[PDB]
Amino acid sequence: STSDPVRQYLHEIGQVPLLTLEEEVELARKVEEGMEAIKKLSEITGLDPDLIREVVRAKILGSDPKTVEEIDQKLKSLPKEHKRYLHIAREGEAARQHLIEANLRLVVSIAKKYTGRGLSFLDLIQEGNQGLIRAVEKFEYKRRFKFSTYATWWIRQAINRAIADQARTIRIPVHMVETINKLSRTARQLQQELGREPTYEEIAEAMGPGWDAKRVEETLKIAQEPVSLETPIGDEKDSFYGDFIPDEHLPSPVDAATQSLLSEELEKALSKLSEREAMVLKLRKGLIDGREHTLEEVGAFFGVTRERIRQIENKALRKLKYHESRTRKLRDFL
Amino acid sequence: DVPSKIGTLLDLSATELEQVLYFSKYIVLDPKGAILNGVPVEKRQLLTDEEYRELRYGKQETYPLPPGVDALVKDGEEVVKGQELAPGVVSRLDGVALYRFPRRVRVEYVKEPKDYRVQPHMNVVVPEGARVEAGDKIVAAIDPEEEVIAEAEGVVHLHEPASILVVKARVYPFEDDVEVSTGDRVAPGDVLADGGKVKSDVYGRVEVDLVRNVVRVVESYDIDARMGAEAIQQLLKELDLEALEKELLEEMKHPSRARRAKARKRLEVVRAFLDSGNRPEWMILEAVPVLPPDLRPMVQVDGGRFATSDLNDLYRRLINRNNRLKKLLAQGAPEIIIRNEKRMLQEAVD
DNA sequence: GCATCCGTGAGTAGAGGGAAGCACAATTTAACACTTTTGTCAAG
DNA sequence: CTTGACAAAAGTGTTAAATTGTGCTATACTGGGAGCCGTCACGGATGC
């Protein structure tokens, strides 16, 4: 018992009897009148219409709480003519709660047709419940249409949007998700007519104007889902995908040792230069603080122009070239 | 992890703990003077959803009348358990019986048993046995063409109700503006409607009948009961480890071996918390830590496809359900929808 | 006692394996026209 | 060491094109589906 969350939810919603046609009309009328009374109260009292509905909703639900009591007492201090709109607002809020509770069976019937598309059954039901709440606010009973006629549009829309937003590890925009679904549906129809898997050219032509084979292949590459690192490989359960993927981010011991050898040999060659010549190259190349320094900031640090540093920076470079050619001690590092 | 650490401190069995944690039964934190089945409700008492609803919202029932037949009772007339409200249905509780939807309104004009057929898209705006001034509306309608008004003064009588609602409540007619509104909770002696002239004599929830010019107080209690880890967390916060240790030490003096063995196991957990300095309420989570991303990588491979760990999917489920509960709470969703979301959030953490 | 629940069971290697559309509003991206930089060729 | 004086490069501002996010649709429709025993055998702890 209680091991099935789906069974537990179905039992709870079955304890609310279904509404008759007479009962549905009364609830819809009460909600609409209550919303109008809230608008009337705000105009007279000057407060935010959004804030007033929260105070009424808080009292009905029961159980900033400090200001909720303060605002409520001001409403109750109105005269009898204005206190009547308070009564209508309270009744309208209670009717909205009862109207939503009696239509929970409708969402379950709709939500069972969307399973197997990336979301669990309970997740589909909860997303559908959000659409049901929206339909209550926008429903109009003057048109003499039944509630299920208008609420079905909102319940289906909420489930569809949730799938396009939460069913993929790498989220794709809704406009591109629709394109992917159309592309797959078109390919299936061509496959059963051609008797074989269609090519990219055939899919592109049937897709419509503005589509070529290059765009078809690019869309298919986008629609690829990542693979799990814990996917078992082989019958014995000891090997997984992650056991074959090397790490390319951290430097290897061989690469780390080459950097150290190059640095110690480079600084050894710099000692053959003058004290001022070495400092210019070490700053104009960025061997201190990691940042290259232009002829201006170098000039600012040493108090000289930029044309002067240009010559001495080049002069020190040419002396290094002559030394290297006579020993061949710095060539293997390139 | 058998034996449960939370259950040992709170003296709750494994069956009881699962029922509260996964939203199956309520647990009492404040009885507020509630009586169930003639026995006062105690703290730490487990209530079913049916029992909780009776204590919190009262008892009432509706009986659908067959088409054409007419009830033998009047509006606002008290009935007893087993009394035949209609020839086709019998009542199951005592209370005030009120008409729900009169399918035919028989207005008695004074100049006259005129018969009016009321469509489901129409509502009656006057009460039974009431004086209606000439020109006032009697039955409202969506279309003004089919709207019915009062030709002259008379007494309006309701006939052929769609159903009869029997609610165990007390009716207090009011003369002036009511000092309370629908949804409030009152206690005996409180000023109810007419600034102290009319006062309630029983606990209950008050709803205002504007058309009937009466105030109804449905007998109920403002009991404090909660489900989930929220109710367990408060119980752990109120625990006094020093006081509990002394009580268990005295029970250790029982000559029976079974009681001594039971008291020793509980005292071992109590002593462990006292020595270490941890708090019992820390066993319930408020903030969930997140592993560093490099330990749950999403990396590209020699080709172009991506590979990722299963922990990323488990983190995505928890975030999606946590964000949906925030939106549901802001919209004032009913408790049934909220309770399902909370149960799903607990399972996502597991 | 006797019912219910829960964690445990050798090592290394290989080798295959691996299901709507639309309109409209915000929001980001790319192209392009000036404009200050900053290295430079030539003197002095 | 310095001044001049370009010439390409880097930097900035505006703006149209592309992409992304959000709301809505009115006959009536109101409690899921899948599974199926060589169900692994044996101690240890716990509840009653």
From TrEMBL, chain A:
- Identify this protein by name: RNA polymerase sigma factor SigA
Species name: Thermus thermophilus (strain ATCC 27634 / DSM 579 / HB8)
Under the cellular component aspect of Gene Ontology, which terms does the record hold? cytoplasm
Q: Which residues of the full protein are shown?
A: 76 to 422 of 423
The UniProt record gives the binding positions of Mg(2+) 3 as A204, G208
Keyword Cytoplasm attached: yes
GO MF entry, a single one? sigma factor activity
The family assignment reads: Belongs to the sigma-70 factor family. RpoD/SigA subfamily.
Task: Provide the binding site for Mg(2+) 7.
Answer: G208, W211
Instruction: Please list the residue ranges annotated as the RNA polymerase sigma-70 domain.
Output: 294-320
Sigma-70 factor domain-2: region residues: 99-169
